[PDB]
Amino acid sequence: XXGXXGGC
């Protein structure tokens, strides 16, 4: 998770 974790 960690605030999203997929494209940033």
Rounded Cα gap, residues 3 and 5, in angstroms: 6
Q: How far apart are CA 8 and CA 4, in angstroms?
A: 8
Q: Which two tokens stand for residue 6?
A: 């997929």
DSSP per-residue letters across 1-8: -TT--S--
Report the Cα 5 to chain-centroid distance in Å: 2
Length of the chain: 8
Technique used by the depositors: NMR
